[PDB]
Write a protein that binds this ligand. Structure first.
Ligand SMILES: COCCNc1nc2ccc(C#CC3(O)CCCCC3)cc2n1-c1ccnc(N)n1
Length: 291
């Protein structure tokens, strides 16, 4: 009864019909927790799209799917991966979305060194997106390099809202333990009521990735690392010598243990460091098929 109850709930928010009628040439490009992600062609237009397929009978939290679809059901931002449609195909949920030909940022931080112009460009894009997302009570809860996709001309788009949540004037905070261990904020790990600020911290951790090539305590087990993040002071850049005072000053506004003292997206947009940010063309040489 439980599973069949969820299907019925989906059918009230997903578009009716079988998308297999107009989609062709599926090619897998990703996998992991939720399900598999493929790209496919639309037969009517010849356009390329990306299709995320999530089996309902394989989710640790089946309700997190509903959240994602009803909350992003055609939200529209220049710096967010646009959703086109959602479908219920058998026991699977299909989310049809924009195809980002540039790939994920993870590929860039593990193979090259980004300069501060390129780091500031990424940050600027993420902040502009988060400022609006937070302004409407939406928390990503999984900001990291995997959640940052690129275009061919190097335009940054925030992706993977599989963990996102909605807060309101009535319910201004969340409680559930959600995200990736290494990028988690301390107030979130310590099992405390948290707000949108948990993304600013994770953004901070992602900045470390762009400099060190990996987040703090990445050598440790997930559980042990979380305990370290919980008890310890803010983490230190292994390549502190490589970063400018401007960046270091910027980063110090992100990795503040007290969520109240930690900066917000709207504030950070006015930081002098973001003036270093360059055009989307500057990201281009970093991409795999250019380097
Ligand atoms: C670079 O390729 C890595 C694997 N591809 C991939 N995995 C994804 C997981 C979740 C979402 C996702 C998601 C959303 O949460 C974003 C907001 C709208 C609803 C779906 C998107 C993923 N992608 C995509 C998608 C498009 N292009 C490319 N290159 N990779």
């Amino acid at each position: 009864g439980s599973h069949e109850q969820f299907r019925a709930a989906l059918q009230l928010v997903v578009d009716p019909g079988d998308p297999r009628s107009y989609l062709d040439n599926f090619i897998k490009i990703g996998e992991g927790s939720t399900g598999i992600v493929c790209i496919a062609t639309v037969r009517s237009s010849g356009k390329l799209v990306a299709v995320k397929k999530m089996d309902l009978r394989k989710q640790q939290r089946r309700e997190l799917l509903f959240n994602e679809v009803v909350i992003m059901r055609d939200y529209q931002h220049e710096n967010v991966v646009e959703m086109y449609n959602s479908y219920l195909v058998g026991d699977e949920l299909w989310v049809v979305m924009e195809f980002l030909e540039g790939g994920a940022l993870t590929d860039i931080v593990t193979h090259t060194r980004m300069n501060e112009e390129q780091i500031a460009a990424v940050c600027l894009a993420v902040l502009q997106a988060l400022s609006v997302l937070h302004a409407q009570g939406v928390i990503h809860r999984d900001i990291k390099s995997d959640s940052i996709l690129l275009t061919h001309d190097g335009r940054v788009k925030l992706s993977d809202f599989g963990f996102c949540a909605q807060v309101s004037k009535e319910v201004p905070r969340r409680k559930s333990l959600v995200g990736t261990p290494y990028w988690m904020a301390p107030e979130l790990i310590s099992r405390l009521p948290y707000g949108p600020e948990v993304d600013i911290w994770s953004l901070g951790i992602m900045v470390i990735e762009m400099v060190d090539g990996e987040p703090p305590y990445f050598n440790e087990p997930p559980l042990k690392a979380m305990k370290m993040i919980r008890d310890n002071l803010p983490p230190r850049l292994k390549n502190l010598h490589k970063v400018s005072p401007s960046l270091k000053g910027f980063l110090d506004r992100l990795l503040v243990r007290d969520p109240a003292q930690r900066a917000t997206a709207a504030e950070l947009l006015k930081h002098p460091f973001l003036a270093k940010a360059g055009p989307p063309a500057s990201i281009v040489p970093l991409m795999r098929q250019n380097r």
